[PDB]
Amino acid sequence: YNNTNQEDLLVLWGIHHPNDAAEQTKLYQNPTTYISVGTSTLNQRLVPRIATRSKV
Amino acid sequence: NHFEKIQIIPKSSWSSHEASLGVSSACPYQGKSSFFRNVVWLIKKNSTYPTIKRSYNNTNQEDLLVLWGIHHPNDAAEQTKLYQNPTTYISVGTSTLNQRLVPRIATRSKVNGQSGRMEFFWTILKPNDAINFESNGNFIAPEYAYKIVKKGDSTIMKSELEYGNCN
Ligand SMILES: *[C@@H]1O[C@H](CO)[C@@H](O[C@@H]2O[C@H](CO)[C@@H](O)[C@H](O)[C@H]2NC(C)=O)[C@H](O)[C@H]1NC(C)=O
Ligand SMILES: *[C@@H]1O[C@H](CO)[C@@H](O)[C@H](O)[C@H]1NC(C)=O
Protein backbone atom coordinates (compact mmCIF):
# COMPACT_ATOMS: atom_id res chain seq x y z
CA TYR A 1 0.00 0.00 0.00
CA ASN A 2 1.18 3.48 -0.93
CA ASN A 3 0.14 6.48 1.13
CA THR A 4 -1.31 8.68 -1.58
CA ASN A 5 -3.02 10.66 1.26
CA GLN A 6 -1.69 13.92 2.78
CA GLU A 7 -1.49 12.83 6.42
CA ASP A 8 0.47 10.26 8.46
CA LEU A 9 -1.18 6.81 8.52
CA LEU A 10 -1.32 4.38 11.45
CA VAL A 11 -0.98 0.90 10.02
CA LEU A 12 -1.59 -2.19 12.17
CA TRP A 13 -0.92 -5.88 11.37
CA GLY A 14 -0.14 -9.14 13.24
CA ILE A 15 1.39 -12.63 13.42
CA HIS A 16 -0.13 -15.93 14.58
CA HIS A 17 1.90 -18.01 17.01
CA PRO A 18 0.31 -21.52 17.00
CA ASN A 19 0.28 -24.33 19.59
CA ASP A 20 2.13 -26.90 17.52
CA ALA A 21 3.39 -28.00 14.08
CA ALA A 22 0.07 -29.80 13.51
CA GLU A 23 -1.97 -26.60 13.74
CA GLN A 24 0.66 -24.71 11.75
CA THR A 25 0.26 -27.01 8.76
CA LYS A 26 -3.48 -27.49 9.29
CA LEU A 27 -4.03 -23.74 8.83
CA TYR A 28 -1.23 -22.68 6.48
CA GLN A 29 0.29 -25.90 5.05
CA ASN A 30 3.75 -24.31 4.86
CA PRO A 31 5.74 -25.51 7.91
CA THR A 32 8.42 -22.78 8.05
CA THR A 33 6.96 -19.26 7.68
CA TYR A 34 7.67 -15.53 8.13
CA ILE A 35 6.11 -12.08 7.53
CA SER A 36 8.42 -9.40 6.21
CA VAL A 37 7.32 -5.73 6.25
CA GLY A 38 9.21 -2.77 4.82
CA THR A 39 9.02 1.01 4.52
CA SER A 40 11.54 3.81 3.98
CA THR A 41 12.36 3.16 7.65
CA LEU A 42 10.97 -0.27 8.63
CA ASN A 43 12.94 -3.50 8.02
CA GLN A 44 10.96 -6.25 9.80
CA ARG A 45 11.06 -10.05 9.30
CA LEU A 46 8.66 -11.71 11.78
CA VAL A 47 8.76 -15.46 12.41
CA PRO A 48 6.03 -17.44 14.13
CA ARG A 49 7.08 -18.92 17.41
CA ILE A 50 5.80 -22.25 18.69
CA ALA A 51 5.49 -22.98 22.41
CA THR A 52 3.05 -24.82 24.65
CA ARG A 53 0.92 -22.33 26.57
CA SER A 54 -1.96 -22.16 29.05
CA LYS A 55 -5.36 -21.54 27.54
CA VAL A 56 -6.52 -17.93 27.77
CA ASN B 1 11.11 -10.01 52.32
CA HIS B 2 11.08 -13.85 52.15
CA PHE B 3 11.47 -16.65 49.62
CA GLU B 4 10.76 -20.30 50.40
CA LYS B 5 12.79 -22.49 48.05
CA ILE B 6 10.93 -25.53 46.66
CA GLN B 7 11.89 -28.34 44.29
CA ILE B 8 9.67 -28.25 41.23
CA ILE B 9 11.46 -30.59 38.77
CA PRO B 10 13.46 -33.20 40.62
CA LYS B 11 16.98 -33.90 39.31
CA SER B 12 16.45 -37.63 39.70
CA SER B 13 13.46 -37.53 37.33
CA TRP B 14 15.52 -37.11 34.11
CA SER B 15 15.48 -40.68 32.79
CA SER B 16 16.47 -40.26 29.11
CA HIS B 17 19.06 -37.49 29.70
CA GLU B 18 22.23 -37.43 31.77
CA ALA B 19 21.67 -35.06 34.68
CA SER B 20 24.86 -35.52 36.77
CA LEU B 21 27.44 -34.72 34.06
CA GLY B 22 26.61 -31.01 33.74
CA VAL B 23 29.60 -29.66 35.55
CA SER B 24 32.56 -27.34 35.00
CA SER B 25 36.01 -26.33 36.20
CA ALA B 26 34.71 -22.73 36.05
CA CYS B 27 32.48 -23.58 39.06
CA PRO B 28 34.68 -25.36 41.66
CA TYR B 29 33.09 -26.37 44.95
CA GLN B 30 36.06 -28.05 46.61
CA GLY B 31 38.33 -29.67 44.03
CA LYS B 32 35.57 -31.66 42.35
CA SER B 33 34.45 -29.12 39.76
CA SER B 34 30.69 -28.33 40.06
CA PHE B 35 27.78 -26.10 38.91
CA PHE B 36 24.93 -23.72 39.82
CA ARG B 37 22.98 -25.72 42.39
CA ASN B 38 19.47 -24.56 41.53
CA VAL B 39 19.48 -25.54 37.88
CA VAL B 40 20.67 -28.68 36.05
CA TRP B 41 22.99 -28.69 33.04
CA LEU B 42 21.33 -31.56 31.10
CA ILE B 43 23.38 -33.56 28.57
CA LYS B 44 23.08 -36.38 26.01
CA LYS B 45 22.44 -39.96 27.24
CA ASN B 46 23.71 -42.98 25.35
CA SER B 47 24.54 -41.10 22.12
CA THR B 48 21.30 -39.06 22.02
CA TYR B 49 19.06 -36.23 23.34
CA PRO B 50 15.31 -36.91 22.98
CA THR B 51 13.00 -33.92 22.79
CA ILE B 52 12.14 -32.88 26.37
CA LYS B 53 8.50 -31.84 27.00
CA ARG B 54 8.14 -31.02 30.72
CA SER B 55 5.81 -28.77 32.68
CA TYR B 56 5.17 -27.51 36.21
CA ASN B 57 1.86 -26.23 37.53
CA ASN B 58 1.75 -23.76 40.39
CA THR B 59 -0.55 -25.58 42.77
CA ASN B 60 0.78 -23.22 45.52
CA GLN B 61 -0.97 -20.04 46.73
CA GLU B 62 1.82 -17.54 46.08
CA ASP B 63 3.70 -16.18 43.04
CA LEU B 64 6.70 -18.34 42.04
CA LEU B 65 10.07 -17.14 40.74
CA VAL B 66 11.20 -19.62 38.13
CA LEU B 67 14.74 -19.52 36.70
CA TRP B 68 16.22 -21.45 33.74
CA GLY B 69 19.01 -21.05 31.13
CA ILE B 70 20.54 -21.75 27.71
CA HIS B 71 24.05 -22.92 26.78
CA HIS B 72 25.83 -21.01 24.03
CA PRO B 73 28.79 -23.22 22.94
CA ASN B 74 32.14 -22.40 21.28
CA ASP B 75 31.57 -24.35 18.08
CA ALA B 76 29.54 -27.00 16.22
CA ALA B 77 31.94 -29.67 17.52
CA GLU B 78 31.09 -28.98 21.16
CA GLN B 79 27.41 -28.61 20.30
CA THR B 80 27.22 -32.14 18.91
CA LYS B 81 29.67 -33.54 21.47
CA LEU B 82 27.32 -32.53 24.29
CA TYR B 83 23.86 -32.71 22.73
CA GLN B 84 24.25 -34.57 19.40
CA ASN B 85 21.44 -32.54 17.81
CA PRO B 86 23.08 -29.79 15.70
CA THR B 87 20.14 -27.33 15.47
CA THR B 88 18.44 -26.73 18.85
CA TYR B 89 16.04 -24.46 20.76
CA ILE B 90 14.29 -24.12 24.16
CA SER B 91 10.69 -23.00 24.09
CA VAL B 92 8.96 -21.86 27.31
CA GLY B 93 5.32 -20.90 27.73
CA THR B 94 2.87 -19.59 30.32
CA SER B 95 -0.43 -17.71 30.21
CA THR B 96 1.81 -14.73 29.37
CA LEU B 97 5.22 -16.04 28.25
CA ASN B 98 5.90 -17.07 24.61
CA GLN B 99 9.66 -17.70 24.43
CA ARG B 100 11.68 -19.70 21.84
CA LEU B 101 15.40 -19.50 22.72
CA VAL B 102 18.07 -20.57 20.24
CA PRO B 103 21.70 -21.25 21.11
CA ARG B 104 24.10 -18.84 19.55
CA ILE B 105 27.58 -19.83 18.41
CA ALA B 106 30.46 -17.33 18.40
CA THR B 107 34.17 -17.41 19.17
CA ARG B 108 34.82 -15.74 22.51
CA SER B 109 37.64 -14.95 24.94
CA LYS B 110 38.00 -17.36 27.83
CA VAL B 111 36.46 -16.12 31.07
CA ASN B 112 37.11 -18.23 34.16
CA GLY B 113 38.71 -20.50 31.55
CA GLN B 114 35.53 -20.93 29.47
CA SER B 115 34.76 -19.57 25.98
CA GLY B 116 31.21 -20.90 26.10
CA ARG B 117 28.42 -18.84 27.65
CA MET B 118 25.39 -19.45 29.80
CA GLU B 119 22.36 -17.08 29.55
CA PHE B 120 19.76 -17.19 32.24
CA PHE B 121 16.10 -16.29 32.06
CA TRP B 122 13.20 -15.98 34.51
CA THR B 123 9.54 -15.43 35.07
CA ILE B 124 6.97 -14.98 37.82
CA LEU B 125 4.51 -17.86 37.48
CA LYS B 126 1.16 -16.88 38.94
CA PRO B 127 -0.72 -19.21 41.24
CA ASN B 128 -2.73 -21.81 39.26
CA ASP B 129 -0.67 -21.30 36.09
CA ALA B 130 1.92 -23.62 34.54
CA ILE B 131 5.19 -23.23 32.74
CA ASN B 132 5.80 -25.63 29.83
CA PHE B 133 9.31 -26.26 28.57
CA GLU B 134 10.28 -28.01 25.38
CA SER B 135 13.82 -28.66 24.19
CA ASN B 136 16.14 -30.42 21.92
CA GLY B 137 19.54 -29.31 23.34
CA ASN B 138 21.38 -26.62 25.36
CA PHE B 139 18.69 -26.51 28.06
CA ILE B 140 19.66 -25.67 31.63
CA ALA B 141 16.57 -26.84 33.50
CA PRO B 142 15.11 -25.65 36.78
CA GLU B 143 15.44 -27.89 39.83
CA TYR B 144 14.57 -25.43 42.59
CA ALA B 145 12.36 -22.34 42.38
CA TYR B 146 11.29 -19.68 44.88
CA LYS B 147 7.88 -19.05 46.43
CA ILE B 148 7.43 -15.35 47.25
CA VAL B 149 6.24 -15.86 50.81
CA LYS B 150 6.14 -12.26 51.92
CA LYS B 151 6.25 -8.87 50.25
CA GLY B 152 7.11 -5.56 51.94
CA ASP B 153 9.54 -2.66 52.14
CA SER B 154 13.13 -3.58 51.43
CA THR B 155 16.11 -2.47 49.39
CA ILE B 156 19.38 -3.70 48.01
CA MET B 157 21.99 -1.67 49.82
CA LYS B 158 25.40 -1.40 48.32
CA SER B 159 27.93 -1.55 51.14
CA GLU B 160 31.31 -3.20 51.71
CA LEU B 161 30.58 -3.40 55.46
CA GLU B 162 29.57 -6.49 57.49
CA TYR B 163 26.92 -7.45 60.05
CA GLY B 164 27.35 -5.37 63.24
CA ASN B 165 25.36 -7.47 65.76
CA CYS B 166 23.21 -4.48 66.59
CA ASN B 167 19.78 -2.96 66.01
C1 LIG C 1 -3.01 -26.28 37.15
O2 LIG C 1 -3.67 -27.28 37.91
C3 LIG C 1 -5.03 -27.07 38.31
C4 LIG C 1 -5.62 -28.39 38.79
O5 LIG C 1 -4.86 -28.84 39.87
C6 LIG C 1 -5.92 -26.55 37.18
O7 LIG C 1 -7.12 -26.10 37.82
C8 LIG C 1 -8.22 -26.10 36.90
O9 LIG C 1 -8.07 -24.98 36.04
C10 LIG C 1 -9.24 -24.54 35.39
C11 LIG C 1 -8.83 -23.54 34.31
O12 LIG C 1 -7.84 -22.66 34.81
C13 LIG C 1 -10.12 -23.95 36.50
O14 LIG C 1 -11.22 -23.24 35.95
C15 LIG C 1 -10.56 -25.06 37.48
O16 LIG C 1 -10.88 -24.52 38.75
C17 LIG C 1 -9.54 -26.19 37.69
N18 LIG C 1 -10.17 -27.47 37.39
C19 LIG C 1 -10.21 -28.50 38.25
C20 LIG C 1 -10.89 -29.75 37.76
O21 LIG C 1 -9.73 -28.44 39.39
C22 LIG C 1 -5.22 -25.50 36.31
O23 LIG C 1 -5.91 -25.31 35.10
C24 LIG C 1 -3.83 -25.93 35.91
N25 LIG C 1 -3.25 -24.83 35.19
C26 LIG C 1 -2.85 -24.89 33.92
C27 LIG C 1 -2.28 -23.64 33.32
O28 LIG C 1 -2.93 -25.90 33.24
C1 LIG D 1 21.89 -47.32 23.51
O2 LIG D 1 21.69 -47.33 22.08
C3 LIG D 1 21.31 -48.51 21.36
C4 LIG D 1 20.59 -48.05 20.10
O5 LIG D 1 21.50 -47.66 19.09
C6 LIG D 1 20.40 -49.44 22.19
O7 LIG D 1 20.08 -50.65 21.52
C8 LIG D 1 21.07 -49.68 23.54
O9 LIG D 1 20.46 -50.70 24.31
C10 LIG D 1 21.02 -48.34 24.27
N11 LIG D 1 21.46 -48.54 25.65
C12 LIG D 1 20.69 -48.31 26.72
C13 LIG D 1 21.35 -48.59 28.05
O14 LIG D 1 19.52 -47.89 26.67
Domain ranges of chain B: 1-161
Q: Is the CB of A54 under 6 A from ligand 1?
A: yes
Q: What gap in Å lies between CA B113 and CA B117, rounded to an integer?
A: 11
Q: What angle do CA B11, B67, B69 make, to 5 degrees?
A: 80
Cβ contact B2:B149 at 8 Å: yes
Q: What angle do CA B29, B31, B35 make, to 5 degrees?
A: 35
Domain at B1-161: CATH architecture:
Alpha-Beta Complex (3.90)
Method for this entry: X-ray
Sheet containing B52-57: order of strands: B52-57, B130-135, B90-93, B98-101
Q: What gap in Å lies between CA A17 and CA B47, rounded to an integer?
A: 33
Helix-strand-coil percent breakdown of chain B, rounded to 5? 5, 45, 50
Going by C-alpha positions, the residue among B42, B54, B44 that lies closest to residue B139 is B42
Minimum CA–CA partner of A55 in chain B: B95
Question: 3-state secondary structure string, B128-156?
Answer: CCEEEEEECCCEEEECEEEEEEECCCCCC
Q: Phi first, then psi: what are they for B33, rounded to 5°?
A: -70, 140
Count of CB contacts below 8 A, A vs B?
35
**Across B8-75, where does the E strand assignment appear?**
24-30, 32-34, 39-41, 52-57, 64-72
Q: Which residues of A touch B52 (CB under 8 A)?
A: none
CA dihedral A56, B6, B11, B15 (to 10 degrees): -40
Q: Is the CB of B129 under 6 A from ligand 1?
A: yes
B15-23 LR contacts (CB < 8 Å, sep 24+): B16/B45, B16/B50, B17/B42, B17/B43, B17/B44, B17/B45, B17/B49, B17/B50, B17/B52, B18/B42, B18/B43, B18/B44, B18/B45, B19/B43, B22/B140
Cβ contact B112:B34 at 8 Å: no
Going by C-alpha positions, the residue among B128, B50, B88, B132 that lies closest to residue A52 is B132
Name the residue at shortest CA distance from atom 5 of ligand 1: B59
Element (H, E) at B123: strand B117-125
Interchain proximity A51–B95, CB inside 8 Å: no
Q: What gap in Å lies between CA B42 and CA B18, rounded to an integer?
A: 6
Interchain proximity B93–A56, CB inside 8 Å: no
C-alpha distances (whole Å) from B125 to each of A46, B139, B147 are: 27, 19, 10
Minimum CA–CA partner of A56 in chain B: B95
C-alpha distances (whole Å) from B129 to each of B26, B58, B143 are: 35, 6, 18
| Chain centroid offset of residue A32 CA | 13
Helix, strand or coil, per DSSP, at residue B83:
helix
Breaks (C-N over 2.5 A) in chain A follow: none
Q: What gap in Å lies between CA A17 and CA B133, rounded to an integer?
A: 16
| Chain centroid offset of residue B105 CA | 19
Cβ contact B97:B123 at 8 Å: yes
Which letter, b or e, does each residue of B59-75 get, where b requires 16 or more Cβ atoms within 10 Å of its Cβ? ebeebbebbbbbbbbbe
**Across chain A, where does the E strand assignment appear?**
35-38, 43-46
C-alpha distances (whole Å) from A5 to each of A10, A11, A13 are: 12, 13, 20
Cβ contact B88:B102 at 8 Å: yes
Q: Is the CB of B130 under 6 A from ligand 1?
A: yes
The residues near B111 (Cβ < 8 Å, ≥ 6 apart) are none
| Chain centroid offset of residue A18 CA | 12
